[PDB]
Design a protein around this ligand. Structure first.
Ligand SMILES: *[C@@H]1O[C@H](CO)[C@@H](O[C@@H]2O[C@H](CO)[C@@H](O[C@@H]3O[C@H](CO[C@H]4O[C@H](CO)[C@@H](O)[C@H](O)[C@@H]4O)[C@@H](O)[C@H](O[C@H]4O[C@H](CO)[C@@H](O)[C@H](O)[C@@H]4O)[C@@H]3O)[C@H](O)[C@H]2NC(C)=O)[C@H](O)[C@H]1NC(C)=O
Ligand SMILES: *[C@@H]1O[C@H](CO)[C@@H](O[C@@H]2O[C@H](CO)[C@@H](O[C@@H]3O[C@H](CO[C@H]4O[C@H](CO)[C@@H](O)[C@H](O)[C@@H]4O)[C@@H](O)[C@H](O[C@H]4O[C@H](CO)[C@@H](O)[C@H](O)[C@@H]4O)[C@@H]3O)[C@H](O)[C@H]2NC(C)=O)[C@H](O)[C@H]1NC(C)=O
Ligand SMILES: *[C@@H]1O[C@H](CO)[C@@H](O[C@@H]2O[C@H](CO)[C@@H](O[C@@H]3O[C@H](CO)[C@@H](O)[C@H](O)[C@@H]3O)[C@H](O)[C@H]2NC(C)=O)[C@H](O)[C@H]1NC(C)=O
Ligand SMILES: *[C@@H]1O[C@H](CO)[C@@H](O[C@@H]2O[C@H](CO)[C@@H](O[C@@H]3O[C@H](CO)[C@@H](O)[C@H](O)[C@@H]3O)[C@H](O)[C@H]2NC(C)=O)[C@H](O)[C@H]1NC(C)=O
Ligand SMILES: *[C@@H]1O[C@H](CO)[C@@H](O)[C@H](O)[C@H]1NC(C)=O
Ligand SMILES: *[C@@H]1O[C@H](CO)[C@@H](O)[C@H](O)[C@H]1NC(C)=O
Ligand SMILES: *[C@@H]1O[C@H](CO)[C@@H](O)[C@H](O)[C@H]1NC(C)=O
Ligand SMILES: *[C@@H]1O[C@H](CO)[C@@H](O)[C@H](O)[C@H]1NC(C)=O
Ligand SMILES: *[C@@H]1O[C@H](CO)[C@@H](O)[C@H](O)[C@H]1NC(C)=O
Ligand SMILES: *[C@@H]1O[C@H](CO)[C@@H](O)[C@H](O)[C@H]1NC(C)=O
Ligand SMILES: *[C@@H]1O[C@H](CO)[C@@H](O)[C@H](O)[C@H]1NC(C)=O
Lengths: 43, 160, 214, 315, 315, 37
C-alpha cells in the first residue's frame, strides 16, 4: 500500500534522471564539438 | 549518408552513455557488496552478486568507453580496432548480464510469490530491494547493449 | 517452485534457562519431493547438523544467538533470537516483535521448573495482570502493547523479580534497510548534482565560445 | 453413652514419616463391651489393624484406645475418617478431616472483629470479610453463617480494585451488639469455582479473663516556651487487646488527624494484659485556650456504659 | 527413659472453637519430676496454659498429659511445636507440624545493621548476615563486599541446627563506627552451587535529614496502691528509626526483660519523628529503696558522645 | 514515506528548473548554429 507508491516514485525518478543525464551528455558533446570545430576553423 | 554521416557525434554520445552506465553499475556493485552481503540472507536471491558480474561488467564498460572516447579524438589512429574489439566482447558481456538479470528476476519473482504479507521480514524486504536493483540494472544494461551494438556496427562499417 | 521455510521452538518460548532442553524443528513444506537434510546457521557458522529437529539437551550461555534453518531446495527461514540467561525468575515470551492484531504468549518461569505462585506482570513498570499460575497470552495486540515487560513472582515462598525484557508491538514497519530506500533518491541527487555540474560547465563553455564564435 | 476423642498423629519433620497414626479414645463405656470399627468415606475399613486394648479399669465403665496407621495418600485426599462404636445398640461416631488449606488459590482472607467504639458506644457494629488476592468478580460467593442465633440480618458485599491486577472483595455484616457480649459464633464462607473446597473463617470475642483497664493522662512536658504540645495517655491491664480510644477535648470529637495510638503489646509477666500509649499533638494556637482534654477509652471489661474518662483542664 | 507421644485434633469446622488441641503424653516419667514445657519454632510461648494432669499412676513410671490450645492461624502457618520433658537432667523432644503440601519454603536471607547501643556507646558495630531454610551447610559461600577496603575484617561464621528440620547460618562482620557514621554500604553474598545467581543484599545508612530526639521522662502516674509502678520515657522527633533505649538504676544497668520499648510509629506531623515510648514496671520494694532512675537514649543525630540521659528521682 | 515524498518534490522542482534551462540553452545554440549556416 504505502511502500509501493514511493517505490514507483523512485523508479520513475531514476528513469527521468537517466534520460536527463543522457540528454545533458549529448548537449555537452555537441557544444564541445562545435567549439572545437569553430576554434580550429577560425584559428 | 544516413549513419555514415550521423556517427560523428553519436559515437561520442554513446561512449559517454557507456561511461555513465558503467559508473552507476559499479556504484550498485560496491554498495550492495558492502551492505547486502551478509550470510543471513540466501544466495539464490543475490544471483548477480555471487559470480563477480557487477564489478567485471563495470570494468569492461569503463575501459571500452574510455578507449572509445580517446579514439574519437584521433589518437595515434590505432585505438579504433582496440575499441571495436572491446565493445565486441562487451556485447557478449552484456548478453551474459541480461541472462543473469532475467534469471535473478524470475528467482525474485518466485521469492515474492512465496512472500505473503508483502515484506513481512528482512528476507522479503531485501528481495524487493534486490528486484528493484534488478530492474535498474536491466534498464542500464539495455542502454549499454544498445550503445555497444551501435558502436560495433558503426566501427564495422568504417573498417570495411 | 521453491517455498519458504519456518522454524518452530519446543517449547515455543524464545527465552529459556541454562541446561534446559529445547527442540528447533524446521518443516517448511520440505515434502515437495523425497526426504532431505537441513542446513543450520548460528552466528554465520554452518554447524554439522542436518536433521529436521535439532535438540539441545543442556542449553548454555553460548547457545544463545541467531538461528536460521534452511531445507534443501528451499530458501532460508526467518531468524530466531534465542536468549538464555541464569536468573532466578524469567519472563518467557513467544516472540519479541508482534504485528498489529497479533497474539503472543507470555509466561513467568522459575529456576529448575520450581513452583511459582502469585505472579504479577508489569508493563512499562505498571502492573496490568495478576496471574496465579496461568500464562497471560495476549490476543489482538495493538500499538499500546509495545513496551518493557517483567514478571514478579514467588519462588517457593521467596519474592523474586525477573529481568526486564523489551517487546515491540508495532505495524508492518519491521525495517532495517530503509536507509537504502534512501538509495534511489540519493543516487538521483548525486546524479542530479553531476548533471548540474555538467550544466554549469556547458553554459560556461557556451559563453566562452559565444565570445569565440562571435 | 461414652466420651469420644479422635486424635491424628504428627508428620514429624526431624525424621521421615509415612505412617500417619490415628487414635480413637472411648471413655466411660461399658466394661467388656467393645465393638469399635473404622469408617472412611462411609465405607468399612479394610486394613486389619483394628486393635482394641483396654486403657485401664473404671469399675463398670471402661476406657478403650483404638489404633490405626495409614499413609500420606490416605490423608492427602481429605477423607472422612471416623471411629464408630456400637454401644447399647447406638452408633456413636466422630468426624475427623484434614483441615482445608488456607489460601487454596493464593487468596488471603482477613476478617476483622468489630471495633469496640462502633459496637459499645455508637451501637452499629459490623463484621468485615476482606478477601484479597483474587482475579475477577466471577462467582465469588461470600456467605455469612450466624451460628446459634441465625437472625434475619443481611449482608452488603462489594468489590474494590487497586493496581496489582488483584481484585478485593469486602463484605459487611451488621450484627447485634448484645450477641458479641454473649459470645455466639459467626463465620464467613468464601466459595470460588476454582476452589476445591469453600473456606471458612470464624472469630468471636477473645476468650480469657476480663481485666478492667487503667487509664492515666500525663501533663505536657514539652517546655511551654516551645511551639508544639504533646499529650500522653497510657492505658494498661486491659484484656483482650480489642479496645477503643477517643479524645473529646472541649466538647466535640477531634478528628483522626492529630492523633496516634501505639500498637498493643504484652506486659512483662504478672497480670495477663496489655498496655497502649495514645499521643496527641497540637500547636500553640489550639493550646492555651482554656479548653478541656479527655482521653476516653472503651473496653468490654468496663462497667456500663463501658466508658472511662480522664480529664485535664488547661487552667 | 520415658517415651513421648504428641497428638492433636483437626478442625471440627461445624462448631466454633477456632482452636487446635495439642496433647503431649509422657509415659514412664519419674514421679514428682515431670517438667514438660511447650516450645514454638524457637518462639517459646509465655502464655500460662499447661493443664498438666496425671492419667494413671503406677508407682515409678505412671503417665501424664500436657494440653495446649492453639489458634487456627498459628497451626496453618506451618509452624512447628514441641513438648520438651526435662527428666533426670536429660531433655526429650516431641515435635509436631502440619506437614507440607509443598517444598521447604525456598531460601531466605536477612541483613541486620548493628544496634545503636553498640554503635555509639560500647563501640562494636557488627553487621549480621543470617540465612535460614537451608537444607544443609554444604559448601555455603558467605562472602562480603565493602565500598572501602580496610583489610582486617575477619568475619565469623557459625551454623545452628534448628528443630524445624532446617539449619540457620549466621555471619557477623565487625566494622568500625566511623565508616557507618560517614556512610558506606556493605553487601553480603551467599552462594550455594544450586543457585542461578548469588543472592546479594545491601545495607547503608538511611538517607535523610537527621533530627535530634527530645526525651521526656514522666513521673509515676499511679497512686499509693503498692503492686507495681510505671515509668514512661517518650522520645520524639528523631530520624532515622534506628534508636537504642535502656534504663539505668542508680548507675547499674537494668536487664532487658524488665523494660519494654514500643515499636516506632510514624509521626502525624511534618517531621518524620517516629515517636516511641518505653515503659518500665518497678516493684514496691524497689521504689521504697529510694532508687534513682535514668533514661539513657542513644541516637546518631546527637553530638558526641551521642547519649541523652534524663534523670528521674523518687523524692 | 514523507521523507522520500519531500525529496521527490524538491527533485521534481530541480528537474523542472534544469529542463527549462536546458531548453533555453538548446534554443540558443540552435539559433547560433542556424546563423552560422
Ligand atoms: C496489590 O495491592 C493491594 C492493595 O495495596 C494488596 O492488598 C493488600 O494486601 C496486604 C497483605 O495481604 C493487606 O495487609 C493486611 O491488611 C489487613 C486488613 O487491614 C485492615 O485493618 C487494619 C487494622 O488492623 C486497618 O488499618 C486497614 O486499613 C484495613 O482496614 C491487616 O489486618 C493485616 O495485618 C495483619 O496481618 C499481618 C501479617 O500480614 C500481621 O503482621 C498483623 O499484625 C495483622 O495481624 C495486613 O496488614 C492489605 O490490607 C491489602 N490491601 C487492601 C486495600 O486491603 C495486594 O496484596 C497487592 N498485590 C500483591 C500481589 O501483593
Ligand atoms: C524453621 O524454624 C526456624 C526457627 O528459628 C525459623 O527461623 C526463624 O525464621 C523467622 C522467619 O522466617 C525469622 O524471623 C525473621 O527475622 C529477621 C531477622 O531477625 C532479627 O531482626 C529482627 C528485627 O528485624 C529482630 O526482631 C529479631 O529478634 C532478630 O534480631 C527479621 O528481619 C524478619 O522480619 C522481616 O520480615 C517480616 C515478615 O516476616 C516483616 O514484617 C519485618 O518488617 C521484616 O522485614 C523476621 O522476623 C527468624 O529470625 C528465624 N530465626 C532464626 C534463629 O534464624 C525458620 O524460618 C523456619 N523455617 C521454615 C521454613 O519454617
Ligand atoms: C554469535 O553471536 C551471539 C550473539 O547473538 C553470541 O552470543 C552472545 O555471547 C555470549 C555467548 O558466547 C553470551 O555471554 C555474554 O557475552 C557478552 C559479550 O557479547 C558479555 O559482555 C556478557 O558478560 C556475557 O558473557 C551473550 O549473552 C550472547 N548474547 C545473547 C544475546 O545472549 C555468540 O557467542 C556468537 N557466537 C560465537 C561462536 O561466539
Ligand atoms: C537477552 O537477555 C538479556 C538478559 O541476560 C537482556 O539483557 C537485559 O537488558 C535489559 C534492557 O531491557 C537490561 O535492563 C537495564 O539494565 C541496565 C544496566 O545498567 C539498567 O541501568 C537499566 O535501568 C535496565 O534495568 C538488563 O540489565 C539486561 N540484563 C543483563 C543481564 O545484562 C537482553 O536485553 C535480551 N535481549 C537481547 C537481544 O540480548
Ligand atoms: C547428515 O549427513 C550425514 C552424511 O551425509 C549422514 O550420515 C547423517 O545421517 C545425516 N543426518 C541425519 C539426521 O540424517
Ligand atoms: C489477564 O489474563 C487473563 C488470563 O487468565 C485474561 O483472561 C485477561 O483478559 C487478562 N487481562 C486482564 C485485564 O485480566
Ligand atoms: C496508548 O497509550 C497512551 C499512553 O499510555 C494513551 O494516551 C493512548 O490513548 C493509548 N492508545 C489508545 C488507542 O488508547
Ligand atoms: C502402624 O504404624 C505405627 C506408626 O509408627 C507403627 O508404630 C506400627 O508398628 C504400625 N503397625 C504395624 C502392624 O506395623
Ligand atoms: C452462590 O453460588 C454460585 C457460586 O459459584 C454463584 O454463582 C451464585 O450467584 C451464588 N448465589 C447466592 C445466592 O449467593
Ligand atoms: C483449652 O483447652 C481445654 C482442654 O480441656 C478446653 O477444655 C478449653 O475449651 C480450651 N479453651 C480454648 C479457649 O480453646
Ligand atoms: C567462598 O568464596 C571465597 C571468595 O570467592 C573463596 O575464596 C572460597 O574458596 C569459597 N569457598 C568457601 C568454601 O567458602
Amino acid at each position: 500500500g504505502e511502500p509501493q507508491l514511493c517505490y514507483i516514485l523512485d523508479a520513475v525518478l531514476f528513469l527521468y534522471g537517466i534520460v536527463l543525464t543522457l540528454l545533458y551528455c549529448r548537449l555537452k558533446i555537441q557544444v564541445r564539438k562545435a567549439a572545437i570545430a569553430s576554434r580550429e576553423k577560425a584559428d | 549518408q544516413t549513419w555514415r554521416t550521423f556517427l560523428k557525434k553519436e559515437l561520442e554520445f554513446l561512449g559517454a552513455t557507456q561511461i555513465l552506465v558503467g559508473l552507476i553499475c559499479l556504484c550498485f556493485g560496491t554498495i550492495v557488496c558492502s551492505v547486502l552481503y551478509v550470510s543471513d540472507f540466501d544466495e539464490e536471491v543475490l544471483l548477480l552478486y555471487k559470480l563477480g558480474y557487477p564489478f567485471w561488467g563495470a570494468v569492461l564498460f569503463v575501459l571500452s568507453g574510455f578507449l572509445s572516447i580517446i579514439s574519437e579524438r584521433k589518437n595515434t589512429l590505432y585505438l579504433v580496432r582496440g575499441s571495436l574489439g572491446a565493445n565486441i566482447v562487451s556485447s557478449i558481456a552484456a548478453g551474459t548480464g541480461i541472462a543473469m538479470l532475467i534469471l535473478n528476476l524470475t528467482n525474485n519473482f518466485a521469492y515474492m510469490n512465496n512472500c505473503k504479507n508483502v515484506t513481512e521480514d528482512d528476507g522479503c524486504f531485501v528481495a524487493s530491494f534486490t528486484t528493484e536493483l534488478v530492474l535498474m540494472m536491466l534498464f542500464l544494461t539495455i542502454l549499454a547493449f544498445c550503445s555497444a551494438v551501435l558502436f560495433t556496427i558503426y566501427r564495422i562499417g568504417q573498417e570495411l | 517452485a521453491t517455498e519458504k521455510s519456518v522454524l518452530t521452538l519446543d517449547p515455543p518460548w524464545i527465552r529459556i534457562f541454562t541446561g534446559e532442553k529445547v527442540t528447533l524443528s524446521c518443516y517448511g513444506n520440505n515434502h515437495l519431493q523425497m526426504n532431505s537434510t537441513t542446513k543450520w546457521i548460528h552466528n554465520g557458522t554452518v554447524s554439522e547438523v542436518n536433521s529436521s529437529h535439532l535438540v539441545i539437551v543442556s542449553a548454555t550461555v553460548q547457545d544463545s544467538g541467531k538461528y536460521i534453518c534452511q531445507k534443501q531446495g528451499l530458501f532460508k527461514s526467518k531468524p530466531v533470537y534465542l536468549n538464555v540467561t541464569q536468573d532466578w525468575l524469567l519472563l518467557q515470551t513467544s516472540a519479541d516483535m508482534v504485528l498489529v492484531h497479533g497474539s503472543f504468549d507470555i509466561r513467568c518461569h522459575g529456576w529448575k521448573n520450581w513452583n511459582v505462585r502469585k505472579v504479577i506482570y508489569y508493563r512499562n513498570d505498571h502492573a496490568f495482570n495478576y496471574s496465579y499460575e496461568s500464562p497471560v497470552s495476549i490476543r489482538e495486540a495493538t500499538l499500546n502493547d509495545s513496551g518493557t515487560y517483567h514478571c514478579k513472582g514467588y519462588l517457593r515462598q521467596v519474592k523474586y523479580e525477573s529481568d526486564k525484557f523489551r517487546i515491540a508491538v508495532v505495524k508492518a514497519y519491521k525495517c532495517k534497510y530503509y536507509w537504502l530506500q534512501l538509495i534511489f533518491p540519493l543516487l538521483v541527487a548525486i546524479l542530479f548534482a553531476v548533471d548540474t555540474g555538467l550544466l554549469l560547465s556547458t553554459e560556461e563553455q557556451f559563453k566562452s565560445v559565444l565570445e569565440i564564435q562571435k | 453413652d461414652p466420651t469420644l476423642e479422635l486424635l491424628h498423629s504428627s508428620c514429624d519433620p526431624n525424621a521421615f514419616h509415612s505412617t500417619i497414626q490415628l487414635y480413637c479414645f472411648i471413655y466411660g463405656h461399658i466394661l467388656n463391651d467393645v465393638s469399635v470399627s473404622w469408617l472412611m468415606d462411609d465405607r468399612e475399613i479394610t486394613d486389619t489393624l483394628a486393635q482394641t486394648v483396654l486403657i485401664k479399669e473404671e469399675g463398670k465403665l471402661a476406657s478403650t484406645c483404638s489404633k490405626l496407621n495409614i499413609t500420606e495418600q490416605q490423608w492427602m485426599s481429605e477423607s472422612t475418617f471416623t471411629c464408630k462404636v456400637t454401644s447399647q445398640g447406638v452408633d456413636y461416631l466422630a468426624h475427623t478431616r484434614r483441615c482445608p488449606d488456607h489460601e487454596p488459590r493464593g487468596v488471603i482472607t482477613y476478617l476483622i472483629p468489630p471495633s469496640p467504639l462502633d459496637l459499645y458506644q455508637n451501637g452499629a457494629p459490623k463484621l468485615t470479610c476482606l478477601v484479597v488476592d483474587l482475579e475477577s468478580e466471577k462467582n465469588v460467593n461470600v456467605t455469612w453463617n450466624q451460628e446459634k442465633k441465625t437472625s434475619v440480618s443481611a449482608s452488603q458485599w462489594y468489590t474494590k480494585h487497586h493496581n496489582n491486577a488483584t481484585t478485593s472483595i469486602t463484605s459487611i455484616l451488621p450484627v447485634v451488639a448484645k450477641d458479641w457480649i454473649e459470645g455466639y459464633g459467626y463465620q464467613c464462607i468464601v466459595d470460588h469455582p476454582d476452589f476445591p473446597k469453600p473456606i471458612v473463617r470464624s472469630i468471636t470475642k477473645t476468650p480469657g479473663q476480663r481485666s478492667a483497664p487503667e487509664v492515666y493522662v500525663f501533663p505536657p512536658p514539652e517546655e511551654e516556651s516551645e511551639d508544639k504540645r504533646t499529650l500522653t495517655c497510657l492505658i494498661q491491664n486491659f484484656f483482650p487487646e480489642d479496645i477503643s480510644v477517643q479524645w473529646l477535648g472541649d466538647g466535640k470529637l477531634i478528628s483522626n488527624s492529630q492523633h496516634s495510638t501505639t500498637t498493643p503489646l504484652k506486659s512483662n509477666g504478672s497480670n495477663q494484659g496489655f498496655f497502649i500509649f495514645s499521643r496527641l499533638e497540637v500547636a500553640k494556637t489550639l493550646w492555651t485556650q482554656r479548653k478541656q482534654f479527655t482521653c476516653q477509652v472503651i473496653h468490654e471489661a468496663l462497667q456500663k456504659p463501658r466508658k472511662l474518662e480522664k480529664t485535664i483542664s488547661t487552667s
